[PDB]
Design a protein around this nucleic acid. Structure first.
Ligand SMILES: [Mg+2]
Ligand SMILES: [Mg+2]
Ligand SMILES: [Mg+2]
Ligand SMILES: [Mg+2]
Ligand SMILES: [Mg+2]
Ligand SMILES: [Mg+2]
Ligand code: NA
Ligand code: NA
Lengths: 244, 244
RNA sequence: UAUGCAUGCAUU
RNA sequence: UAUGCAUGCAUU
Protein backbone atom coordinates (compact mmCIF):
# COMPACT_ATOMS: atom_id res chain seq x y z
CA UNK A 1 0.00 0.00 0.00
CA UNK A 2 1.39 3.42 1.12
CA UNK A 3 -0.37 5.02 -1.84
CA UNK A 4 0.09 8.76 -2.42
CA UNK A 5 -2.64 11.08 -1.14
CA UNK A 6 -5.43 11.95 -3.51
CA UNK A 7 -4.23 15.53 -3.90
CA UNK A 8 -0.91 14.26 -5.28
CA UNK A 9 -2.66 11.86 -7.67
CA UNK A 10 -4.83 14.75 -8.82
CA UNK A 11 -1.78 16.84 -9.73
CA UNK A 12 -0.41 13.83 -11.62
CA UNK A 13 -3.58 13.49 -13.71
CA UNK A 14 -3.27 17.16 -14.64
CA UNK A 15 0.30 16.70 -15.82
CA UNK A 16 -0.74 13.61 -17.79
CA UNK A 17 -3.53 15.42 -19.64
CA UNK A 18 -1.31 18.39 -20.50
CA UNK A 19 1.50 16.28 -21.95
CA UNK A 20 -0.97 14.01 -23.75
CA UNK A 21 -1.43 16.78 -26.32
CA UNK A 22 2.08 16.06 -27.58
CA UNK A 23 1.41 12.44 -28.47
CA UNK A 24 1.82 11.57 -32.15
CA UNK A 25 0.07 8.26 -32.83
CA UNK A 26 0.93 7.91 -36.50
CA UNK A 27 4.16 6.94 -38.23
CA UNK A 28 6.86 9.61 -38.62
CA UNK A 29 9.89 7.56 -39.75
CA UNK A 30 10.48 6.19 -43.23
CA UNK A 31 11.43 2.73 -41.95
CA UNK A 32 7.99 2.42 -40.33
CA UNK A 33 6.21 2.20 -43.69
CA UNK A 34 8.77 -0.23 -45.21
CA UNK A 35 7.53 -3.85 -45.54
CA UNK A 36 10.70 -5.23 -43.94
CA UNK A 37 11.51 -2.15 -41.80
CA UNK A 38 14.54 -1.46 -44.04
CA UNK A 39 16.65 1.24 -42.43
CA UNK A 40 15.70 0.22 -38.91
CA UNK A 41 19.06 -0.60 -37.33
CA UNK A 42 18.73 0.10 -33.58
CA UNK A 43 15.89 -0.88 -31.22
CA UNK A 44 15.89 0.14 -27.56
CA UNK A 45 14.44 -1.53 -24.48
CA UNK A 46 13.93 -0.19 -20.97
CA UNK A 47 13.04 -1.68 -17.59
CA UNK A 48 13.44 -1.15 -13.85
CA UNK A 49 14.17 -4.03 -11.43
CA UNK A 50 13.86 -3.85 -7.67
CA UNK A 51 15.49 -5.19 -4.54
CA UNK A 52 13.30 -7.59 -2.53
CA UNK A 53 13.93 2.60 -2.89
CA UNK A 54 16.92 0.73 -4.27
CA UNK A 55 16.33 -0.28 -7.89
CA UNK A 56 18.18 -0.82 -11.13
CA UNK A 57 17.07 1.02 -14.29
CA UNK A 58 18.39 -0.37 -17.53
CA UNK A 59 18.51 0.76 -21.15
CA UNK A 60 19.66 -1.54 -23.91
CA UNK A 61 19.99 -0.97 -27.62
CA UNK A 62 19.75 -3.92 -29.95
CA UNK A 63 20.69 -4.23 -33.60
CA UNK A 64 17.89 -4.89 -36.03
CA UNK A 65 17.08 -7.49 -37.26
CA UNK A 66 19.75 -9.53 -35.41
CA UNK A 67 18.52 -8.44 -31.95
CA UNK A 68 22.04 -8.38 -30.49
CA UNK A 69 22.84 -6.06 -27.59
CA UNK A 70 25.13 -3.25 -28.75
CA UNK A 71 24.64 -0.87 -25.81
CA UNK A 72 23.79 -1.50 -22.20
CA UNK A 73 23.39 0.94 -19.34
CA UNK A 74 22.27 -0.49 -15.99
CA UNK A 75 22.19 2.06 -13.20
CA UNK A 76 21.45 1.86 -9.47
CA UNK A 77 18.88 4.51 -8.53
CA UNK A 78 16.78 5.43 -5.52
CA UNK A 79 13.16 5.50 -6.65
CA UNK A 80 10.78 7.86 -4.86
CA UNK A 81 7.22 7.19 -5.77
CA UNK A 82 5.31 3.98 -5.04
CA UNK A 83 3.60 1.97 -7.74
CA UNK A 84 0.07 3.21 -8.38
CA UNK A 85 -1.83 1.81 -11.33
CA UNK A 86 -2.20 4.51 -13.96
CA UNK A 87 0.75 6.50 -12.63
CA UNK A 88 3.62 4.16 -13.50
CA UNK A 89 5.56 6.96 -15.22
CA UNK A 90 5.78 8.98 -12.03
CA UNK A 91 7.83 6.10 -10.59
CA UNK A 92 10.01 4.97 -13.52
CA UNK A 93 10.14 7.73 -16.13
CA UNK A 94 12.63 10.29 -14.67
CA UNK A 95 15.28 7.56 -14.50
CA UNK A 96 14.54 6.23 -17.98
CA UNK A 97 14.81 9.77 -19.39
CA UNK A 98 18.11 10.10 -17.55
CA UNK A 99 19.41 6.94 -19.26
CA UNK A 100 18.58 8.27 -22.73
CA UNK A 101 20.48 11.49 -21.99
CA UNK A 102 23.43 9.47 -20.71
CA UNK A 103 23.43 7.52 -23.97
CA UNK A 104 23.40 10.79 -25.95
CA UNK A 105 26.57 11.84 -24.12
CA UNK A 106 28.35 8.49 -24.26
CA UNK A 107 27.39 6.82 -27.58
CA UNK A 108 25.09 9.24 -29.45
CA UNK A 109 25.52 7.10 -32.59
CA UNK A 110 23.71 4.22 -30.83
CA UNK A 111 20.63 6.31 -30.04
CA UNK A 112 17.73 3.94 -30.76
CA UNK A 113 15.29 4.64 -33.56
CA UNK A 114 12.46 3.25 -31.41
CA UNK A 115 12.10 2.16 -27.78
CA UNK A 116 10.05 -0.73 -26.40
CA UNK A 117 8.70 0.21 -22.96
CA UNK A 118 7.65 -2.32 -20.26
CA UNK A 119 4.16 -0.90 -19.81
CA UNK A 120 1.29 0.58 -21.76
CA UNK A 121 1.12 3.60 -24.00
CA UNK A 122 -2.31 4.93 -24.92
CA UNK A 123 -3.97 1.80 -23.47
CA UNK A 124 -4.26 3.68 -20.23
CA UNK A 125 -6.83 5.17 -17.87
CA UNK A 126 -6.19 8.64 -19.32
CA UNK A 127 -4.68 7.66 -22.68
CA UNK A 128 -1.21 8.61 -21.52
CA UNK A 129 0.75 5.64 -20.18
CA UNK A 130 4.41 5.36 -19.31
CA UNK A 131 5.28 4.63 -22.95
CA UNK A 132 3.62 7.84 -24.17
CA UNK A 133 5.19 9.65 -21.22
CA UNK A 134 8.72 8.57 -22.13
CA UNK A 135 8.04 9.35 -25.80
CA UNK A 136 6.83 12.89 -25.14
CA UNK A 137 9.83 13.72 -22.91
CA UNK A 138 12.44 12.26 -25.27
CA UNK A 139 10.54 12.67 -28.58
CA UNK A 140 11.73 9.16 -29.44
CA UNK A 141 9.29 6.75 -31.08
CA UNK A 142 8.04 4.46 -28.29
CA UNK A 143 5.98 1.28 -28.13
CA UNK A 144 4.02 0.21 -25.07
CA UNK A 145 4.26 -3.51 -24.33
CA UNK A 146 2.33 -4.78 -21.32
CA UNK A 147 2.31 -8.33 -19.93
CA UNK A 148 -1.22 -8.23 -18.54
CA UNK A 149 -4.31 -6.29 -19.56
CA UNK A 150 -4.86 -2.85 -18.03
CA UNK A 151 -8.63 -2.77 -17.53
CA UNK A 152 -9.80 0.64 -18.80
CA UNK A 153 -12.74 1.93 -20.89
CA UNK A 154 -14.76 -1.29 -20.59
CA UNK A 155 -11.79 -3.58 -21.26
CA UNK A 156 -11.80 -6.60 -18.91
CA UNK A 157 -9.97 -9.91 -18.50
CA UNK A 158 -13.35 -11.63 -18.37
CA UNK A 159 -14.65 -14.78 -20.08
CA UNK A 160 -15.23 -13.05 -23.40
CA UNK A 161 -11.69 -11.66 -23.43
CA UNK A 162 -10.32 -15.10 -22.52
CA UNK A 163 -12.34 -16.54 -25.40
CA UNK A 164 -10.58 -14.21 -27.82
CA UNK A 165 -7.21 -15.28 -26.41
CA UNK A 166 -8.21 -18.83 -27.38
CA UNK A 167 -8.63 -17.64 -30.96
CA UNK A 168 -5.00 -16.46 -30.97
CA UNK A 169 -3.54 -19.66 -32.39
CA UNK A 170 -0.20 -18.83 -33.99
CA UNK A 171 2.65 -16.44 -33.34
CA UNK A 172 1.74 -13.07 -34.77
CA UNK A 173 -2.02 -13.41 -34.32
CA UNK A 174 -3.75 -10.34 -32.91
CA UNK A 175 -7.09 -8.97 -31.94
CA UNK A 176 -7.97 -5.34 -31.26
CA UNK A 177 -8.70 -3.93 -27.84
CA UNK A 178 -11.83 -1.92 -28.57
CA UNK A 179 -12.78 0.61 -25.91
CA UNK A 180 -16.36 1.52 -25.11
CA UNK A 181 -15.69 4.73 -27.05
CA UNK A 182 -15.25 2.73 -30.26
CA UNK A 183 -11.53 3.52 -30.06
CA UNK A 184 -8.94 0.82 -30.72
CA UNK A 185 -6.63 1.37 -27.72
CA UNK A 186 -4.23 -1.48 -28.42
CA UNK A 187 -3.82 -5.02 -29.65
CA UNK A 188 -3.57 -8.39 -28.04
CA UNK A 189 -0.62 -10.17 -29.62
CA UNK A 190 0.44 -13.79 -29.43
CA UNK A 191 4.25 -13.55 -29.26
CA UNK A 192 5.12 -16.93 -30.76
CA UNK A 193 3.78 -20.40 -31.45
CA UNK A 194 4.71 -21.74 -28.01
CA UNK A 195 3.08 -19.02 -25.89
CA UNK A 196 -0.59 -18.60 -25.03
CA UNK A 197 -0.59 -15.57 -22.72
CA UNK A 198 -0.71 -12.53 -25.04
CA UNK A 199 1.24 -9.30 -24.91
CA UNK A 200 -0.77 -6.08 -24.81
CA UNK A 201 0.69 -3.66 -27.38
CA UNK A 202 -0.25 0.02 -27.61
CA UNK A 203 1.14 3.15 -29.24
CA UNK A 204 3.61 5.12 -27.18
CA UNK A 205 4.65 7.95 -29.55
CA UNK A 206 5.50 8.58 -33.22
CA UNK A 207 4.39 5.15 -34.40
CA UNK A 208 1.15 3.60 -35.57
CA UNK A 209 -0.52 0.66 -33.88
CA UNK A 210 -0.19 -1.82 -36.74
CA UNK A 211 3.48 -0.93 -37.12
CA UNK A 212 4.03 -1.17 -33.33
CA UNK A 213 2.38 -4.60 -33.29
CA UNK A 214 4.32 -5.90 -36.29
CA UNK A 215 7.58 -4.62 -34.85
CA UNK A 216 6.94 -6.10 -31.40
CA UNK A 217 6.22 -9.42 -33.09
CA UNK A 218 9.59 -9.22 -34.86
CA UNK A 219 11.42 -8.68 -31.57
CA UNK A 220 9.85 -11.78 -29.92
CA UNK A 221 12.28 -14.67 -29.63
CA UNK A 222 10.40 -15.53 -26.44
CA UNK A 223 7.17 -14.15 -25.04
CA UNK A 224 8.80 -10.91 -23.87
CA UNK A 225 10.20 -8.85 -26.78
CA UNK A 226 13.96 -9.09 -26.79
CA UNK A 227 14.73 -5.39 -26.00
CA UNK A 228 12.52 -5.44 -22.89
CA UNK A 229 13.65 -8.98 -22.04
CA UNK A 230 17.32 -8.01 -22.14
CA UNK A 231 16.78 -4.89 -20.05
CA UNK A 232 14.82 -6.92 -17.50
CA UNK A 233 17.40 -9.71 -17.44
CA UNK A 234 20.41 -7.42 -17.23
CA UNK A 235 18.89 -5.11 -14.62
CA UNK A 236 17.96 -8.03 -12.32
CA UNK A 237 21.37 -9.66 -12.87
CA UNK A 238 22.97 -6.31 -12.05
CA UNK A 239 21.18 -6.29 -8.69
CA UNK A 240 22.26 -9.87 -7.93
CA UNK A 241 25.90 -8.99 -8.62
CA UNK A 242 25.92 -6.18 -6.04
CA UNK A 243 24.16 -8.73 -3.87
CA UNK A 244 20.71 -7.85 -2.56
CA UNK B 1 35.65 -30.13 2.36
CA UNK B 2 36.45 -33.03 4.71
CA UNK B 3 39.83 -34.73 5.21
CA UNK B 4 40.43 -38.33 4.16
CA UNK B 5 40.40 -39.17 7.89
CA UNK B 6 36.68 -38.44 7.93
CA UNK B 7 36.11 -40.06 4.52
CA UNK B 8 37.34 -43.54 5.48
CA UNK B 9 35.50 -43.39 8.81
CA UNK B 10 32.45 -42.79 6.60
CA UNK B 11 32.92 -45.73 4.23
CA UNK B 12 33.36 -47.86 7.35
CA UNK B 13 30.27 -46.59 9.16
CA UNK B 14 28.20 -47.27 6.03
CA UNK B 15 29.30 -50.91 5.75
CA UNK B 16 28.77 -51.40 9.47
CA UNK B 17 25.19 -50.17 9.40
CA UNK B 18 24.36 -51.91 6.10
CA UNK B 19 24.06 -55.19 8.03
CA UNK B 20 20.78 -53.97 9.57
CA UNK B 21 18.98 -53.26 6.30
CA UNK B 22 15.71 -55.18 5.91
CA UNK B 23 14.66 -55.13 2.23
CA UNK B 24 11.39 -57.02 2.57
CA UNK B 25 8.01 -56.04 3.93
CA UNK B 26 7.52 -56.11 7.70
CA UNK B 27 4.26 -54.17 8.14
CA UNK B 28 0.76 -55.57 7.67
CA UNK B 29 -0.41 -52.61 5.56
CA UNK B 30 2.38 -53.26 3.03
CA UNK B 31 0.79 -56.54 1.97
CA UNK B 32 -2.64 -55.03 1.81
CA UNK B 33 -3.94 -54.52 -1.76
CA UNK B 34 -5.09 -50.98 -0.93
CA UNK B 35 -2.59 -50.34 1.89
CA UNK B 36 -5.47 -50.56 4.37
CA UNK B 37 -4.14 -49.64 7.79
CA UNK B 38 -1.60 -47.16 6.42
CA UNK B 39 -2.62 -43.85 7.94
CA UNK B 40 0.58 -41.74 8.26
CA UNK B 41 3.33 -41.13 5.68
CA UNK B 42 6.40 -39.05 6.49
CA UNK B 43 8.62 -36.96 4.24
CA UNK B 44 12.02 -35.41 5.02
CA UNK B 45 14.21 -32.81 3.35
CA UNK B 46 16.86 -30.18 4.04
CA UNK B 47 17.11 -26.85 2.24
CA UNK B 48 20.31 -24.84 1.90
CA UNK B 49 21.20 -21.15 1.76
CA UNK B 50 22.79 -19.71 -1.35
CA UNK B 51 25.03 -17.57 0.87
CA UNK B 52 25.89 -19.80 3.87
CA UNK B 53 27.64 -23.14 3.50
CA UNK B 54 26.85 -23.62 7.21
CA UNK B 55 23.20 -22.66 7.72
CA UNK B 56 20.58 -25.12 6.48
CA UNK B 57 16.96 -25.97 7.27
CA UNK B 58 15.88 -29.56 7.96
CA UNK B 59 12.18 -30.33 7.83
CA UNK B 60 9.93 -33.30 8.61
CA UNK B 61 6.28 -33.64 7.66
CA UNK B 62 3.71 -36.32 8.34
CA UNK B 63 0.77 -36.61 5.96
CA UNK B 64 -2.52 -38.40 6.34
CA UNK B 65 -3.10 -41.33 4.03
CA UNK B 66 -4.73 -41.52 1.59
CA UNK B 67 -5.78 -37.83 1.70
CA UNK B 68 -2.14 -36.59 1.70
CA UNK B 69 -3.02 -33.69 4.02
CA UNK B 70 -0.16 -32.42 6.19
CA UNK B 71 -0.84 -33.26 9.85
CA UNK B 72 2.64 -32.59 11.31
CA UNK B 73 5.45 -30.17 10.43
CA UNK B 74 8.79 -29.57 12.12
CA UNK B 75 11.26 -27.25 10.36
CA UNK B 76 14.62 -26.53 12.01
CA UNK B 77 17.59 -24.29 11.23
CA UNK B 78 20.72 -26.39 11.74
CA UNK B 79 24.47 -26.00 11.50
CA UNK B 80 25.81 -28.23 8.73
CA UNK B 81 28.95 -30.19 9.61
CA UNK B 82 29.95 -31.99 6.41
CA UNK B 83 29.90 -30.62 2.85
CA UNK B 84 28.02 -32.41 0.10
CA UNK B 85 30.07 -35.33 -1.21
CA UNK B 86 28.34 -37.79 -3.51
CA UNK B 87 27.72 -41.06 -1.70
CA UNK B 88 27.85 -39.51 1.78
CA UNK B 89 24.65 -37.44 1.81
CA UNK B 90 23.57 -38.98 5.13
CA UNK B 91 26.64 -37.63 6.90
CA UNK B 92 25.39 -34.14 5.96
CA UNK B 93 21.60 -34.39 6.41
CA UNK B 94 20.82 -37.58 8.35
CA UNK B 95 21.87 -36.43 11.88
CA UNK B 96 19.33 -33.63 11.59
CA UNK B 97 16.62 -35.93 10.26
CA UNK B 98 17.17 -38.30 13.18
CA UNK B 99 16.80 -35.36 15.55
CA UNK B 100 13.52 -34.42 13.91
CA UNK B 101 12.28 -37.98 14.45
CA UNK B 102 13.23 -37.89 18.11
CA UNK B 103 11.51 -34.52 18.51
CA UNK B 104 8.29 -35.88 17.00
CA UNK B 105 8.28 -38.75 19.49
CA UNK B 106 8.51 -36.20 22.31
CA UNK B 107 5.90 -33.79 20.91
CA UNK B 108 3.26 -35.84 19.06
CA UNK B 109 4.13 -39.51 19.57
CA UNK B 110 0.82 -40.50 17.96
CA UNK B 111 1.77 -38.97 14.58
CA UNK B 112 4.91 -41.11 14.19
CA UNK B 113 4.82 -42.02 10.47
CA UNK B 114 4.49 -45.65 9.45
CA UNK B 115 6.82 -44.98 6.53
CA UNK B 116 9.18 -42.20 5.48
CA UNK B 117 9.88 -41.02 1.94
CA UNK B 118 13.45 -39.68 1.75
CA UNK B 119 14.75 -37.15 -0.81
CA UNK B 120 17.58 -39.36 -2.00
CA UNK B 121 18.48 -42.92 -2.79
CA UNK B 122 18.21 -46.00 -0.63
CA UNK B 123 19.97 -49.19 -1.70
CA UNK B 124 20.65 -47.60 -5.12
CA UNK B 125 24.00 -46.35 -3.88
CA UNK B 126 27.75 -46.68 -4.41
CA UNK B 127 27.94 -48.93 -1.33
CA UNK B 128 24.35 -50.15 -1.28
CA UNK B 129 23.63 -47.91 1.71
CA UNK B 130 22.17 -44.57 0.73
CA UNK B 131 20.71 -41.86 2.91
CA UNK B 132 17.32 -43.58 2.92
CA UNK B 133 18.79 -46.82 4.27
CA UNK B 134 20.83 -44.75 6.69
CA UNK B 135 17.78 -43.05 8.14
CA UNK B 136 15.92 -46.36 8.24
CA UNK B 137 18.59 -48.21 10.19
CA UNK B 138 19.05 -45.32 12.64
CA UNK B 139 15.32 -44.90 13.28
CA UNK B 140 14.14 -48.46 12.45
CA UNK B 141 11.28 -46.81 10.53
CA UNK B 142 10.37 -48.12 7.07
CA UNK B 143 11.94 -45.80 4.48
CA UNK B 144 11.62 -45.35 0.72
CA UNK B 145 14.41 -43.81 -1.35
CA UNK B 146 13.18 -41.33 -3.97
CA UNK B 147 15.77 -39.70 -6.21
CA UNK B 148 15.11 -37.02 -8.83
CA UNK B 149 18.10 -37.90 -10.97
CA UNK B 150 19.94 -41.15 -11.48
CA UNK B 151 22.85 -42.02 -9.22
CA UNK B 152 25.19 -43.66 -11.72
CA UNK B 153 26.47 -46.75 -9.91
CA UNK B 154 27.15 -50.36 -10.94
CA UNK B 155 26.98 -49.79 -14.67
CA UNK B 156 23.83 -47.69 -14.45
CA UNK B 157 24.06 -44.71 -16.79
CA UNK B 158 21.81 -41.91 -18.05
CA UNK B 159 22.86 -42.72 -21.61
CA UNK B 160 20.96 -43.14 -24.88
CA UNK B 161 19.68 -46.58 -23.86
CA UNK B 162 18.34 -45.19 -20.57
CA UNK B 163 16.73 -42.21 -22.33
CA UNK B 164 14.95 -44.52 -24.79
CA UNK B 165 13.37 -46.35 -21.86
CA UNK B 166 12.20 -43.07 -20.36
CA UNK B 167 10.38 -42.42 -23.65
CA UNK B 168 8.70 -45.81 -23.15
CA UNK B 169 7.21 -44.55 -19.87
CA UNK B 170 3.84 -43.39 -21.13
CA UNK B 171 1.49 -42.73 -18.20
CA UNK B 172 1.65 -42.17 -14.47
CA UNK B 173 2.67 -45.42 -12.82
CA UNK B 174 4.72 -46.80 -15.71
CA UNK B 175 8.07 -48.18 -14.60
CA UNK B 176 11.19 -49.97 -15.69
CA UNK B 177 13.72 -51.67 -13.43
CA UNK B 178 17.24 -50.41 -12.76
CA UNK B 179 19.54 -53.41 -13.17
CA UNK B 180 23.16 -53.12 -12.11
CA UNK B 181 25.96 -54.90 -13.92
CA UNK B 182 25.62 -57.69 -11.32
CA UNK B 183 22.08 -58.37 -12.58
CA UNK B 184 20.69 -57.14 -9.26
CA UNK B 185 17.59 -54.92 -9.24
CA UNK B 186 18.67 -51.78 -7.37
CA UNK B 187 15.56 -49.70 -8.02
CA UNK B 188 12.81 -48.63 -10.39
CA UNK B 189 12.31 -45.68 -12.69
CA UNK B 190 8.75 -44.46 -12.15
CA UNK B 191 6.65 -42.01 -14.13
CA UNK B 192 5.09 -40.09 -11.24
CA UNK B 193 2.15 -38.34 -12.91
CA UNK B 194 0.53 -38.15 -16.36
CA UNK B 195 1.74 -34.58 -16.85
CA UNK B 196 5.45 -35.13 -16.12
CA UNK B 197 8.06 -36.77 -18.30
CA UNK B 198 11.03 -36.75 -15.91
CA UNK B 199 11.09 -40.03 -13.94
CA UNK B 200 11.66 -40.70 -10.27
CA UNK B 201 14.30 -43.23 -9.21
CA UNK B 202 12.82 -45.30 -6.38
CA UNK B 203 14.81 -47.75 -4.28
CA UNK B 204 14.38 -49.62 -0.99
CA UNK B 205 15.38 -47.80 2.17
CA UNK B 206 14.44 -50.15 5.05
CA UNK B 207 11.70 -52.59 6.09
CA UNK B 208 9.90 -52.46 2.72
CA UNK B 209 10.08 -54.25 -0.60
CA UNK B 210 10.75 -52.50 -3.90
CA UNK B 211 7.40 -53.32 -5.50
CA UNK B 212 5.60 -51.85 -2.50
CA UNK B 213 7.92 -48.81 -2.34
CA UNK B 214 7.20 -48.08 -6.01
CA UNK B 215 3.45 -48.41 -5.66
CA UNK B 216 3.30 -46.26 -2.54
CA UNK B 217 5.48 -43.55 -4.07
CA UNK B 218 3.09 -43.46 -7.03
CA UNK B 219 0.08 -43.11 -4.68
CA UNK B 220 1.63 -40.07 -3.00
CA UNK B 221 2.21 -38.15 -6.29
CA UNK B 222 -0.16 -35.22 -6.73
CA UNK B 223 2.71 -33.75 -8.79
CA UNK B 224 6.05 -35.12 -9.93
CA UNK B 225 7.59 -34.94 -6.44
CA UNK B 226 5.79 -37.20 -3.92
CA UNK B 227 3.64 -35.11 -1.64
CA UNK B 228 5.52 -35.89 1.65
CA UNK B 229 8.93 -34.97 0.20
CA UNK B 230 7.40 -32.09 -1.76
CA UNK B 231 5.85 -30.61 1.39
CA UNK B 232 9.10 -30.87 3.34
CA UNK B 233 10.98 -29.17 0.51
CA UNK B 234 8.45 -26.34 0.25
CA UNK B 235 8.32 -25.73 4.01
CA UNK B 236 12.08 -25.93 4.51
CA UNK B 237 12.80 -23.49 1.65
CA UNK B 238 10.09 -21.09 2.85
CA UNK B 239 11.78 -21.11 6.26
CA UNK B 240 15.14 -20.20 4.71
CA UNK B 241 13.41 -17.53 2.62
CA UNK B 242 11.76 -15.78 5.58
CA UNK B 243 15.10 -15.77 7.44
CA UNK B 244 16.79 -14.06 4.46
C1' U C 1 7.25 -5.22 -9.23
C1' A C 2 8.74 -9.03 -6.26
C1' U C 3 7.67 -13.94 -4.70
C1' G C 4 5.40 -18.83 -4.71
C1' C C 5 3.61 -23.32 -7.35
C1' A C 6 3.56 -26.33 -11.71
C1' U C 7 6.24 -28.49 -16.35
C1' G C 8 11.07 -28.67 -19.00
C1' C C 9 16.25 -27.13 -20.13
C1' A C 10 21.10 -25.54 -18.35
C1' U C 11 24.71 -25.00 -14.58
C1' U C 12 26.22 -27.16 -10.00
C1' U D 1 21.61 -28.37 -3.52
C1' A D 2 21.14 -23.40 -4.96
C1' U D 3 20.78 -20.24 -9.08
C1' G D 4 19.55 -18.85 -14.19
C1' C D 5 16.30 -19.43 -18.63
C1' A D 6 11.81 -21.15 -20.82
C1' U D 7 6.04 -22.04 -20.63
C1' G D 8 1.60 -21.58 -17.65
C1' C D 9 -1.12 -20.38 -13.01
C1' A D 10 -1.59 -17.74 -8.45
C1' U D 11 -0.64 -13.65 -4.94
C1' U D 12 0.45 -8.39 -5.38
MG1 LIG E 1 9.11 -3.47 -15.48
MG1 LIG F 1 11.08 -6.38 -15.24
MG1 LIG G 1 17.21 -33.11 -0.36
MG1 LIG H 1 14.87 -29.84 -1.41
MG1 LIG I 1 10.04 -9.25 -13.23
MG1 LIG J 1 15.87 -28.07 -4.98
NA1 NA K 1 18.13 -3.20 -41.00
NA1 NA L 1 -6.92 -45.19 5.44
Amino acid sequence: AERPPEETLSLWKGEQARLKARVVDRDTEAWQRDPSFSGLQKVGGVDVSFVKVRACASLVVLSYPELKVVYEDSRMVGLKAPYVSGFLAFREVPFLVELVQRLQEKEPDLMPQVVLVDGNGVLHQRGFGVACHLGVLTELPCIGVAKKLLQVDGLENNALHKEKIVLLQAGGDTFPLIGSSGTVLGMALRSHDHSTKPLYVSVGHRISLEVAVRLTHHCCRFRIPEPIRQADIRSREYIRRTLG
